[PDB]
Amino acid sequence: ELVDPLTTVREQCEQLEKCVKARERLELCDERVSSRSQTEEDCTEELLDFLHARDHCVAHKLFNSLK
Amino acid sequence: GRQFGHLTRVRHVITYSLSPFEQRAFPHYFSKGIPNVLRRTRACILRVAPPFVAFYLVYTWGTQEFEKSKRKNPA
Amino acid sequence: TNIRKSHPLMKIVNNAFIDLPAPSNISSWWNFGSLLGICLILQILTGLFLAMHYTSDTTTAFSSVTHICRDVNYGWIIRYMHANGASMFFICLYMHVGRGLYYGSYTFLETWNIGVILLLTVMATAFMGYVLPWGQMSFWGATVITNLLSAIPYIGTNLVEWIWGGFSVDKATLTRFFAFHFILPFIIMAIAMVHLLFLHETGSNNPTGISSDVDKIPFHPYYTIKDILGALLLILALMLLVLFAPDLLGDPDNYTPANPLNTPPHIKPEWYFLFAYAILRSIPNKLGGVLALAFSILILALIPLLHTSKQRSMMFRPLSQCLFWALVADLLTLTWIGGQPVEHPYITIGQLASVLYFLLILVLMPTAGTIENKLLKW
Amino acid sequence: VAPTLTARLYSLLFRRTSTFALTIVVGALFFERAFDQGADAIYEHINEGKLWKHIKHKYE
Amino acid sequence: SDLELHPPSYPWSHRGLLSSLDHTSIRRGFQVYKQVCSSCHSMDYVAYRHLVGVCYTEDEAKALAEEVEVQDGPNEDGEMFMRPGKLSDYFPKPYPNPEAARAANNGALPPDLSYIVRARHGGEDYVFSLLTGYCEPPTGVSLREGLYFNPYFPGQAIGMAPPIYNEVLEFDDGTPATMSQVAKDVCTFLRWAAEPEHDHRKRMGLKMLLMMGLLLPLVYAMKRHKWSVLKSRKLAYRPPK
Amino acid sequence: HLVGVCYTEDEAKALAEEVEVQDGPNEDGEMFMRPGKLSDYFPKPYPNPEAARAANNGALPPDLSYIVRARHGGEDYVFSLLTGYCEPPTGVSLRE
Numbered sequence: 001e002l003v004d005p006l007t008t009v010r011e012q013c014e015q016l017e018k019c020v021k022a023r024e025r026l027e028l029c030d031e032r033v034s035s036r037s038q039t040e041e042d043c044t045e046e047l048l049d050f051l052h053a054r055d056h057c058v059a060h061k062l063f064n065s066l067k
Numbered sequence: 068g069r070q071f072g073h074l075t076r077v078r079h080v081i082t083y084s085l086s087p088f089e090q091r092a093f094p095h096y097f098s099k100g101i102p103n104v105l106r107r108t109r110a111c112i113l114r115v116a117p118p119f120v121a122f123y124l125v126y127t128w129g130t131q132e133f134e135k136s137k138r139k140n141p142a
Numbered sequence: 143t144n145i146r147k148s149h150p151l152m153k154i155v156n157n158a159f160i161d162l163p164a165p166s167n168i169s170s171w172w173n174f175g176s177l178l179g180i181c182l183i184l185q186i187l188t189g190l191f192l193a194m195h196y197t198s199d200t201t202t203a204f205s206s207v208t209h210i211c212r213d214v215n216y217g218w219i220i221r222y223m224h225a226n227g228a229s230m231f232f233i234c235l236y237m238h239v240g241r242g243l244y245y246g247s248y249t250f251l252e253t254w255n256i257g258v259i260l261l262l263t264v265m266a267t268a269f270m271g272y273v274l275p276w277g278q279m280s281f282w283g284a285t286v287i288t289n290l291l292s293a294i295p296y297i298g299t300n301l302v303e304w305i306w307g308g309f310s311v312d313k314a315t316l317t318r319f320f321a322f323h324f325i326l327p328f329i330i331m332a333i334a335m336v337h338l339l340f341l342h343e344t345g346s347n348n349p350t351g352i353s354s355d356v357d358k359i360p361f362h363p364y365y366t367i368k369d370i371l372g373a374l375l376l377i378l379a380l381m382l383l384v385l386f387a388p389d390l391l392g393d394p395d396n397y398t399p400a401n402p403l404n405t406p407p408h409i410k411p412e413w414y415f416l417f418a419y420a421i422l423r424s425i426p427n428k429l430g431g432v433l434a435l436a437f438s439i440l441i442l443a444l445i446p447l448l449h450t451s452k453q454r455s456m457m458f459r460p461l462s463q464c465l466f467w468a469l470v471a472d473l474l475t476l477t478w479i480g481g482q483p484v485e486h487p488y489i490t491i492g493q494l495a496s497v498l499y500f501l502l503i504l505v506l507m508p509t510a511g512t513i514e515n516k517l518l519k520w
Numbered sequence: 521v522a523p524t525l526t527a528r529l530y531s532l533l534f535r536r537t538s539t540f541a542l543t544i545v546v547g548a549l550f551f552e553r554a555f556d557q558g559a560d561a562i563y564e565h566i567n568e569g570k571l572w573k574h575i576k577h578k579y580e
Numbered sequence: 581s582d583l584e585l586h587p588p589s590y591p592w593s594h595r596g597l598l599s600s601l602d603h604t605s606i607r608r609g610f611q612v613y614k615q616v617c618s619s620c621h622s623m624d625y626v627a628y629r630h631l632v633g634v635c636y637t638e639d640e641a642k643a644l645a646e647e648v649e650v651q652d653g654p655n656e657d658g659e660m661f662m663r664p665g666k667l668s669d670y671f672p673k674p675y676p677n678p679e680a681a682r683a684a685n686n687g688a689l690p691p692d693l694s695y696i697v698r699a700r701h702g703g704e705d706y707v708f709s710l711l712t713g714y715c716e717p718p719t720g721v722s723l724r725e726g727l728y729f730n731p732y733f734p735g736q737a738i739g740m741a742p743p744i745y746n747e748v749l750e751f752d753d754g755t756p757a758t759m760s761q762v763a764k765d766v767c768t769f770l771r772w773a774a775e776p777e778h779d780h781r782k783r784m785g786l787k788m789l790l791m792m793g794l795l796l797p798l799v800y801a802m803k804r805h806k807w808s809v810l811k812s813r814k815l816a817y818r819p820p821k
Numbered sequence: 822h823l824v825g826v827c828y829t830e831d832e833a834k835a836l837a838e839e840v841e842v843q844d845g846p847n848e849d850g851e852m853f854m855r856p857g858k859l860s861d862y863f864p865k866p867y868p869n870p871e872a873a874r875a876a877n878n879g880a881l882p883p884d885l886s887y888i889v890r891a892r893h894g895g896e897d898y899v900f901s902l903l904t905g906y907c908e909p910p911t912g913v914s915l916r917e
């Protein structure tokens with residue numbers, strides 16, 4: 001039962017507009033690749049964009065509280 | 068070679084000069100200073116700037132085309 | 143009479159930097175000669191102290207360098223002043239060759255050619271310099287480049303193995319480079335003295351390209367102090383790098399000890415060669431690329447025969463001013479390209495900048511000159 | 521008091537390249553120190569990331 | 581695989597120009613090295629004495645070195661014993677031959693942490709983000725449950741397990757040790773291992789700017805004063821007739 | 822080194838192959854033993870210097886790679902030291 005500032009901050013950050021759209025495009029592709037078989041368009045890219053938008057905002061807010 | 072006294076021939080030209088301990092080192096430094104620099108900039112922008120923005124445009128484009136060429140949609 | 147004038151030693155000094163008639167005219171672009179001199183002794187001075195500790199065997203190559211920055215007192219500023227001094231040296235070098243081209247200073251055949259030799263020399267000097275700490279980039283940059291000579295017909299092989307001291311970039315190859323990187327700056331300095339000897343025959347050129355015999359001033363106190371101030375600026379630049387952004391111009395990859403089987407994906411030479419690297423790979427030929435890369439620097443020696451204007455300086459010629467900066471910009475493109483992977487846009491744009499560089503020098507500037515003459519009824 | 525300052529400074533210490541030098545060397549002494557105080561004091565004020573750590577871990 | 585994502589810019593307390601390192605944060609980071617990485621990561625260029633002026637005290641430093649057995653020189657029999665560990669000792673640890681890293685893991689070399697921050701691209705930022713941004717595979721690619729997944733890593737797929745939440749701990753005056761708060765520290769320590777001079781130079785840098793901020797104008801005025809004579813010279817041409 | 826000098830190529834190999842060396846590490850970070858090539862030197866007796874000492878009593882039997890050039894009187898001194906071995910005169914006892 002620990003305090004994980006990363007997870008606390010990730011939640012509110014992972015929410016925001018930019019991230020929704022990328023997570024949206026992610027799930028879109030997720031299911032696209034899930035509902036196909038013998039496909040190789042492998043859904044890696046959409047994850048990264050989501051991380052960028054998320055992690056950029058993760059940096060601005062994080063350390064501010066970190067002890 | 069070289070040396071003063073043997074450089075070249077000159078006649079009829081007077082030169083008035085002043086001891087540095089008598090004048091100021093920065094007369095109207097900003098007063099006349101800035102106007103001049105603008106003037107010099109103006110005098111040269113059209114010759115210096117254009118190739119640089121041309122590079123700049125080719126730089127940002129070339130960069131975008133690189134990044135956007137490494138993703139795929141259909142096919 | 144006056145000792146400064148007649149003592150067999152001082153005469154030199156006096157006629158070199160005290161009484162020497164100089165144009166009242168010369169501007170900041172003329173400071174680079176003295177800064178190049180300062181860069182030289184600085185590389186010699188810090189470089190020496192670095193050699194009192196650096197050991198030249200693969201086993202301790204990297205290690206000794208680390209030993210320097212951590213254990214050796216202030217070995218770190220020394221190490222960084224050295225590294226950054228090399229870059230400062232190239233900035234001034236390129237600025238110097240810039241001033242010469244813009245202002246027509248190259249009409250001094252001998253002075254200028256000695257300068258081309260100064261260029262290749264400081265260049266050859268620095269290529270070897272960076273192989274020393276035996277970093278990934280060192281070994282690899284050392285491998286990529288050396289091999290280039292393997293394109294020379296019937297002899298490239300034998301030659302490359304000969305300067306290698308084996309069949310690869312081995313132990314022989316590191317000590318060798320240490321030795322040459324030590325002796326080259328001394329020869330540089332003597333050749334720079336002949337640069338000055340020949341330069342002193344005519345005196346300096348000036349911004350207008352018009353003869354200034356009619357308005358000469360003594361080098362001291364004017365250009366001793368204008369030279370002092372501009373050295374302080376070079377110290378600012380230099381110190382800003384070592385004391386704030388020491389690795390900014392350096393690859394992080396050279397901080398990883400060499401490994402002959404590894405081979406990084408990244409693989410580029412030091413910033414001061416990128417333009418030439420670009421030009422080289424823009425050609426899908428072993429011999430072509432290398433030949434073209436050579437022609438890329440050795441063309442500084444073609445410049446005087448391509449002079450076409452009835453005026454020496456470019457100060458009063460706008461078609462040429464435009465072409466000049468296009469040349470600068472085109473090198474900046476070449477730098478940029480050379481720092482990028484050989485893929486997508488970059489290939490063809492890199493091949494364009496190449497042809498351009500050559501068109502701009504070998505044809506566009508000479509032609510602009512003829513037109514500017516025609517426009518003046520000359 | 522103001523003109524006579526630069527003046528007296530010239531009078532008693534500047535003509536003779538002797539004193540002129542005697543002063544810059546003597547002036548370099550005091551300066552080197554006073555600069556290192558203020559400079560370090562400045563480096564400290566913008567930081568306080570080491571040294572007051574000592575008051576904690578030891579004192580024996 | 582052949583596509584990548586670059587680290588964000590975390591507001592380190594030494595990212596600033598004239599900004600010293602947090603030494604309290606270098607300790608925690610050291611501790612992070614001693615238990616976790618020290619069994620997989622070499623740090624050959626740092627020694628126990630190096631820590632003295634930095635974090636710990638003289639005595640503190642000794643005891644830390646004395647908690648391992650080294651291998652001092654041979655004696656009379658041409659031997660090799662083992663020793664408590666001095667101060668002159670470095671941190672050469674894990675495996676003897678390189679391949680012993682390999683055999684232990686599967687190929688895979690856990691590169692030495694003496695020079696990491698300076699040797700990746702993105703300093704502490706890349707390491708911190710690789711340590712912290714550990715995540716789960718999207719789709720269409722399976723690893724080998726050996727080659728764990730990482731977005732902040734070239735090929736997004738490679739080798740190291742996330743030992744960053746597995747929590748150890750020992751902060752004398754105490755601090756919670758989350759994944760993140762333990763990462764800043766190993767990174768804040770990894771900077772200093774790659775550049776122990778960090779703080780000293782920035783002090784000189786401050787002096788360098790202060791000095792140059794005094795010398796520069798001063799030399800200018802000196803040069804202005806001597807050129808005075810040429811700047812104000814007036815010409816007149818008086819030809820005959 | 823012996824090849825162009827005394828023996829032949831093949832002869833030289835076999836002579837080296839009559840000892841077990843210690844070639845490089847492999848995969849496990851190990852150290853095995855090898856027949857001996859040609860690239861091998863003659864590093865033999867004792868590892869640490871003092872192992873010469875422990876074996877004998879102090880006393881280092883100096884390397885013979887440079888002996889003739891390192892004594893004074895070349896082969897003459899070594900030859901005479903080897904050959905002129907003799908019995909103690911009087912008044913001094915050794916330590917056998």
Ligand code: HEM
Binds near residue numbers: 171238254330348
């Ligand atoms: C080892 C590096 C070099 C050093 C130390 C060096 C030194 C100097 C010095 C002290 C001057 C005095 C006047 C001035 O700077 O304008 C000068 C001028 C000149 N240098 Fe260099 N130089 C070097 C490289 C070059 C290069 C690479 C070139 C061109 C290939 C070059 C060609 C010239 C020319 C033509 C001038 C005459 C400038 C004028 O009067 O406008 N030198 N150099």
Ligand code: HEM
Binds near residue numbers: 224268269327
């Ligand atoms: C004869 C005086 C010189 C000596 C004794 C010298 C010796 C050394 C030594 C021992 C190293 C390896 C240690 C280290 O990297 O810090 C080195 C690095 C280097 N020096 Fe020199 N060198 C001298 C002149 C030069 C010159 C003329 C240049 C060209 C500007 C130069 C540019 C370099 C470069 C590029 C490196 C490798 C990059 C690095 O610093 O990591 N040095 N030098």
Ligand code: HEM
Binds near residue numbers: 616691739741
């Ligand atoms: C806080 C302690 C540790 C830190 C800071 C650390 C940090 C790192 C870093 C920065 C790299 C290189 C990343 C890159 O190549 O870009 C790395 C590589 C690696 N380390 Fe760790 N690590 C730590 C503990 C471990 C542990 C416990 C293991 C054992 C699972 C481990 C095994 C590896 C391996 C196998 C690699 C190679 C990855 C690969 O190339 O496939 N390290 N580590």
